[PDB]
Design a protein that fits this description.
Residues 105-117 are annotated as: Important for membrane-damaging activities in eukaryotes and bacteria. The chain is mainly α and 121 residues long. It has four helices and two strands. Helix content is 39%, strand content 7%.
């Protein structure tokens, strides 16, 4: 769910998830998967493919239970969809922290439409 998603990203990334990634680039942010501008983008480009392989659950509404155990996010959901969705989010929260050095803030809010085309998930 996005209530979870953000918690990990603020945890893993240390930033406020709406101002840093709410709308950064072609993929991250709002409706649309454009073609990745940089890496703190394609972290999102993939998070969106991740999400589209799930079936017994809503990527944006269902809530699950994850943990911040000894500075790490850990999922324990057993629900084969809530769990495999936790992981999905867990990985972007990391990738997003991971490529925080190439992060560029010119893209903070990019004109979505003016963006390349997406590849196929």
């Amino acid at each position: 769910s996005l209530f979870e998603l953000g918690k990990m990203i603020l945890q893993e990334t240390g930033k406020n998830p709406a101002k840093s990634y709410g709308a950064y680039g072609c993929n991250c942010g709002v409706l649309g998967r454009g073609k990745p501008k940089d890496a703190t983008d394609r972290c999102c480009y993939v998070h969106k493919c991740c999400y589209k392989k799930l079936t017994g659950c809503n990527p944006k509404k269902d809530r699950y239970s994850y943990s911040w155990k000894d500075k790490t996010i850990v999922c324990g959901e057993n629900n084969s969809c809530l769990k495999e969705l936790c992981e999905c989010d867990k990985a972007v929260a990391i990738c997003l922290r991971e490529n925080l050095n190439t992060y560029n803030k010119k893209y903070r809010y990019y004109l979505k439409p003016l963006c390349k085309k997406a590849d196929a998930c």
